[PDB]
Amino acid sequence: ILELEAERELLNPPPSPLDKKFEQWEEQQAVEATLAAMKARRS
């Protein structure tokens, strides 16, 4: 099992942690912007 998993992963590299950091940061920015626009539109 470990061999097959490692081989499949070796054929196609998973995303680097930097990519994860970037996507997490930008989705945080997105949710903040959306909630801010919502709570501002109500007033």
Binding site: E27, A30, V31, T34, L35, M38, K39, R42
Partner: protein
């Protein structure tokens, strides 16, 4: 609706929920905007043949 009554927490969780569906919508729109021109071209080829 959840933001109303000042219950910001549920609003935050729902806005977080919305993101996956937004992303899937974007991906599908991409794929369709791609495929359209190809079916147009193949239809033209069929006419000519």
């Amino acid at each position: 609706a959840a933001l109303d009554r000042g219950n910001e927490q549920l609003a935050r969780e729902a806005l977080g929920q919305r993101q996956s569906y937004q992303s899937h919508t974007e991906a599908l729109g991409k794929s369709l905007g791609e495929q359209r021109a190809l079916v147009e071209q193949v239809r033209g080829q069929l006419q000519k043949l």
